[PDB]
Write an enzyme that holds these catalytic residues in place. Structure first.
Site, PDB file in Angstrom:
ATOM      1  N   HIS A 189      -6.090   5.591  19.547  1.00  0.00           N
ATOM      2  CA  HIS A 189      -6.131   4.722  18.066  1.00  0.00           C
ATOM      3  C   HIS A 189      -6.095   5.835  16.763  1.00  0.00           C
ATOM      4  CE1 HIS A 189      -7.627   1.139  20.034  1.00  0.00           C
ATOM      5  NE2 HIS A 189      -8.383   1.991  20.630  1.00  0.00           N
TER       6      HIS A 189
ATOM      7  N   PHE B  24     -10.262  -3.941  13.332  1.00  0.00           N
ATOM      8  CA  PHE B  24     -10.897  -2.897  13.682  1.00  0.00           C
ATOM      9  C   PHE B  24     -10.842  -1.876  12.384  1.00  0.00           C
ATOM     10  CE2 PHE B  24     -10.270   0.802  17.400  1.00  0.00           C
ATOM     11  CZ  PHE B  24     -11.626   0.768  17.462  1.00  0.00           C
TER      12      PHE B  24
ATOM     13  N   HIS C 118      -9.660   2.213   8.695  1.00  0.00           N
ATOM     14  CA  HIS C 118      -8.923   1.278   9.953  1.00  0.00           C
ATOM     15  C   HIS C 118      -8.027   1.908  10.853  1.00  0.00           C
ATOM     16  CE1 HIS C 118      -4.954   0.690   8.238  1.00  0.00           C
ATOM     17  NE2 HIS C 118      -5.661   0.754   7.071  1.00  0.00           N
ATOM     18  N   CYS C 119      -7.992   1.373  11.867  1.00  0.00           N
ATOM     19  CA  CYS C 119      -6.981   1.821  13.032  1.00  0.00           C
ATOM     20  C   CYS C 119      -5.603   1.365  12.576  1.00  0.00           C
ATOM     21  CB  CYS C 119      -7.167   1.243  14.466  1.00  0.00           C
ATOM     22  SG  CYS C 119      -5.884   1.634  15.526  1.00  0.00           S
ATOM     23  N   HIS C 120      -4.714   2.327  12.472  1.00  0.00           N
ATOM     24  CA  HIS C 120      -3.446   1.879  12.088  1.00  0.00           C
ATOM     25  C   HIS C 120      -2.371   1.448  12.913  1.00  0.00           C
ATOM     26  CE1 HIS C 120      -0.167   2.029   8.838  1.00  0.00           C
ATOM     27  NE2 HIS C 120      -1.059   2.665   8.053  1.00  0.00           N
ATOM     28  N   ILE C 121      -2.895   0.889  13.950  1.00  0.00           N
ATOM     29  CA  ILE C 121      -2.343  -0.248  14.960  1.00  0.00           C
ATOM     30  C   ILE C 121      -2.533  -1.262  14.358  1.00  0.00           C
ATOM     31  CG2 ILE C 121      -2.026  -1.316  17.051  1.00  0.00           C
ATOM     32  CD1 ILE C 121      -2.774   1.766  18.624  1.00  0.00           C
TER      33      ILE C 121
ATOM     34  N   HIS D 294       3.772   0.336   2.588  1.00  0.00           N
ATOM     35  CA  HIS D 294       3.998  -0.653   3.585  1.00  0.00           C
ATOM     36  C   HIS D 294       3.225  -2.080   3.141  1.00  0.00           C
ATOM     37  CE1 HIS D 294       0.091   0.420   5.283  1.00  0.00           C
ATOM     38  NE2 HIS D 294       0.472   1.577   5.452  1.00  0.00           N
TER      39      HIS D 294
ATOM     40  N   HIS E  20       0.746   4.646   1.169  1.00  0.00           N
ATOM     41  CA  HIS E  20      -0.016   5.145   2.115  1.00  0.00           C
ATOM     42  C   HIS E  20      -0.232   6.557   1.991  1.00  0.00           C
ATOM     43  CE1 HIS E  20      -1.271   6.005   6.638  1.00  0.00           C
ATOM     44  NE2 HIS E  20      -0.944   7.103   6.193  1.00  0.00           N
TER      45      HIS E  20
ATOM     46  N   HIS F 277      -7.027   5.802  10.022  1.00  0.00           N
ATOM     47  CA  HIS F 277      -6.651   6.060   8.713  1.00  0.00           C
ATOM     48  C   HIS F 277      -7.827   5.911   7.554  1.00  0.00           C
ATOM     49  CE1 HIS F 277      -4.308   6.504   5.168  1.00  0.00           C
ATOM     50  NE2 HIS F 277      -4.231   5.093   4.860  1.00  0.00           N
TER      51      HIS F 277
ATOM     52  N   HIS G 163      -4.110  -4.192  15.693  1.00  0.00           N
ATOM     53  CA  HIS G 163      -5.378  -3.842  15.824  1.00  0.00           C
ATOM     54  C   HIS G 163      -6.310  -4.205  14.789  1.00  0.00           C
ATOM     55  CE1 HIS G 163      -4.971  -1.008  19.562  1.00  0.00           C
ATOM     56  NE2 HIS G 163      -4.443  -2.140  19.940  1.00  0.00           N
TER      57      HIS G 163
ATOM     58  N   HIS H   6       0.823  -1.264   0.122  1.00  0.00           N
ATOM     59  CA  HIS H   6       0.231   0.126  -0.057  1.00  0.00           C
ATOM     60  C   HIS H   6       0.843   1.155  -0.312  1.00  0.00           C
ATOM     61  CE1 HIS H   6      -3.470   2.907   1.066  1.00  0.00           C
ATOM     62  NE2 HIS H   6      -2.529   3.206   2.002  1.00  0.00           N
TER      63      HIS H   6
ATOM     64  N   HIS I 249       0.548  -4.414   3.153  1.00  0.00           N
ATOM     65  CA  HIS I 249      -1.022  -4.179   3.905  1.00  0.00           C
ATOM     66  C   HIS I 249      -1.464  -5.738   3.594  1.00  0.00           C
ATOM     67  CE1 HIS I 249      -4.543  -2.294   5.187  1.00  0.00           C
ATOM     68  NE2 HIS I 249      -3.928  -0.990   4.575  1.00  0.00           N
TER      69      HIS I 249
ATOM     70  N   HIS J  88      -8.257   5.508   3.338  1.00  0.00           N
ATOM     71  CA  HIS J  88      -7.586   5.353   2.232  1.00  0.00           C
ATOM     72  C   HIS J  88      -8.128   5.976   1.050  1.00  0.00           C
ATOM     73  CE1 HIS J  88      -5.285   1.030   2.896  1.00  0.00           C
ATOM     74  NE2 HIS J  88      -5.800   1.411   3.700  1.00  0.00           N
TER      75      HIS J  88
HETATM   76  O1  LIG Z   1      -2.784   2.639   5.452  1.00  0.00           O
HETATM   77  O2  LIG Z   1      -2.541   1.562   6.132  1.00  0.00           O
HETATM   78 CU   LIG Z   2      -6.032   0.846  17.599  1.00  0.00          CU
HETATM   79 CU   LIG Z   3      -0.947   2.809   6.182  1.00  0.00          CU
HETATM   80 CU   LIG Z   4      -3.270   4.228   3.366  1.00  0.00          CU
HETATM   81 CU   LIG Z   5      -4.567   0.897   5.240  1.00  0.00          CU
END
Ligand SMILES: [O-][O-]
Ligand SMILES: [Cu+2]
Ligand SMILES: [Cu+2]
Ligand SMILES: [Cu+2]
Ligand SMILES: [Cu+2]
Length: 495
Positions: free
Chosen positions: A397, A463, A452-455, A110, A67, A400, A458, A65, A112, A402
């Site tokens: 949290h 999430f 989604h949460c970027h943790i 990164h 980002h 993010h 998670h 991805h 994904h 996309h």
């Molecule tokens: O954007 O993970």
């Molecule tokens: Cu989170």
């Molecule tokens: Cu990302």
């Molecule tokens: Cu992204």
């Molecule tokens: Cu993402």
């Protein structure tokens, strides 16, 4: 090293020891972090990803991805596994071919798929602006002024449990850092400056989890860019930077020639700076080569507050100046219970057929789309509002979206909305229990977009949901290459 905008990117396994502890990794372009992918705004990017992975312990499939890149017309190139593509299988390759109209600034890329980016597949992505309005503010902007902050783990991602609190074993700045436990005196990264020069420092969180309190002893930082969006000048002495966020700041090298600690304190893992953990070195040309002996200010007097940021451009805020002042307003119920996260009661679990393929196969509505309860359709050319009230198990949290950036109408720890000139960005902390972080965007990009949460831990615990933006126009807007159509047959046959 910088490569691109047209380049090969090989994905390989390699053992690395960034904190002195050797363990397996998944590498993009052979290094950690991955090489910087770069181009100028409006460039066509052609990234040929060669999956050469053999070590199943971290998965030999992959998907990448870009980002913060909107990918308008190229939703197929976005990278989230089973949202926009099947993973590329080992021994195959795939051409991520896209443009970046309208966008400039600091990004990253990164894996994904699952929690694979934790295992090493992460690096910076910079789109340079030949007419950057911030140009006059600094002397030096290049590969030596990129700063990555990264959580590193001794335990293979696939084996993290999950979740289950998970914590890093060290902090790496530009790929080097020291272990939190039983700290060995391993090499630290150095950032070198010359008395009287101003630097555009590109601070990039490539974190799988922790946020960092970032500061440089003796020095100020003037923020000029946030998650890709040019900002008015904001001088701070500390920066809390959440996972996947980016800042460009001007560093004026105005202190005496010497060695100054660069500090990045994570919100979990090792606390403080004993033996040189959470640290790198700001060295002036002319200084002795030794460890800094500097100290942080006892109290930081101008730390970053998100509400103090304002776009440099007249972005404003779409819609009406009151909560719900949008065509399609949402309020998400974000929960955690029994080791899984939910959005409106549904934990995300990746579908067999990617969301985008499902649509291309003839699905027309969120009701038609799997996973059930994990997709919310959005109509086209509409103002969306998404309130994201915190409370769910830690926290804070970083959410993010996309395919979009967004006005942060309301930030963490502050219940006052801003409908005039709030900062725009792509990853936002939703703060703490009782907060009501709220974002707004327009639907000008048909395609299935991950929220989604970027943790990452998670995300694997569910999430996430998909905004299926303008389902009717999705196929027409995103013509796919044959190689994309080839992915799912390959993946499914191999598995
Ligand atoms: O954007 O993970
Ligand atoms: Cu989170
Ligand atoms: Cu990302
Ligand atoms: Cu992204
Ligand atoms: Cu993402």
């Amino acid at each position: 090293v910088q490569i691109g905008p047209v380049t090969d990117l090989h994905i390989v396994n390699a053992d690395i020891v960034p904190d002195g502890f050797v363990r397996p990794a998944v590498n993009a372009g052979g290094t950690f972090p991955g090489p910087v992918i770069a181009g100028n705004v409006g460039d066509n990017f052609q990234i040929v990803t060669f999956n050469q992975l053999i070590e199943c312990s971290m998965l030999v499939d992959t998907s990448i991805h870009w980002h913060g890149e909107f990918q308008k017309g190229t939703n197929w190139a976005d990278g989230p596994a089973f949202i926009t593509q099947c993973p590329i299988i080992v021994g195959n390759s795939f051409s991520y071919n896209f443009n970046v109209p309208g966008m400039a600034g600091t990004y990253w890329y990164h894996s994904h798929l699952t929690t694979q980016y934790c295992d090493g597949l992460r690096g910076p992505f910079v789109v340079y602006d030949p007419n950057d309005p911030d140009a006059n503010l600094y002397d030096v902007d290049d590969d030596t002024t990129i700063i990555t902050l990264a959580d590193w783990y001794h335990v293979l991602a696939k084996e993290m449990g999950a979740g289950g609190a998970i914590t890093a074993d060290s902090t790496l700045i530009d790929g080097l850092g020291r272990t939190h436990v039983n700290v060995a005196a391993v090499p630290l990264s150095v950032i070198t400056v010359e008395v009287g020069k101003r630097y555009r420092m590109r601070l990039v969180s490539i974190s799988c989890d922790p946020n960092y309190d970032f500061s440089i002893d003796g020095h100020d930082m003037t923020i000029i860019e946030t998650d890709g969006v040019d900002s008015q000048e904001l001088t701070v002495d500390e920066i809390q930077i959440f996972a996947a966020q980016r800042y460009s700041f001007v560093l004026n090298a105005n202190q005496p020639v010497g060695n100054y600690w660069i500090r990045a304190n994570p919100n979990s893992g090792g606390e403080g700076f004993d033996g040189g953990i959470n640290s790198a070195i700001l060295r002036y040309d002319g200084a002795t080569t030794a460890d800094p002996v500097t100290v942080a200010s006892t109290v930081h007097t101008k730390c970053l507050i998100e509400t103090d940021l304002h776009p440099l451009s007249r972005n404003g805020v779409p819609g009406n100046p009151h909560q719900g002042g949008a065509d399609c307003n949402l309020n998400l119920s974000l929960g955690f219970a029994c080791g899984n996260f939910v959005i409106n009661g549904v934990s995300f679990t990746p579908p067999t057929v990617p969301v985008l393929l499902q649509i291309c196969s003839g699905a027309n509505t969120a009701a038609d789309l799997l996973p059930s309860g994990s997709v919310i359709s959005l109509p086209s050319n509409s103002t969306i509002e998404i309130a994201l009230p915190a409370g769910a198990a830690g926290g804070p949290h970083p959410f993010h979206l996309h395919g979009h950036d967004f006005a942060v109408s309301e930030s963490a720890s502050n219940s006052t909305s801003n409908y005039d000139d709030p900062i725009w960005r792509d990853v936002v902390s939703i703060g703490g229990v009782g907060d009501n972080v709220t974002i707004r965007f327009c639907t000008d990009n048909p395609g299935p977009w991950f929220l989604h949460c970027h943790i990452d831990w998670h995300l694997d615990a569910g999430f996430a949901i998909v905004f299926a933006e303008d389902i009717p126009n999705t196929a027409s807007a995103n013509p796919v290459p044959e190689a994309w159509s080839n992915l799912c047959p390959s993946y499914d046959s191999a598995h």
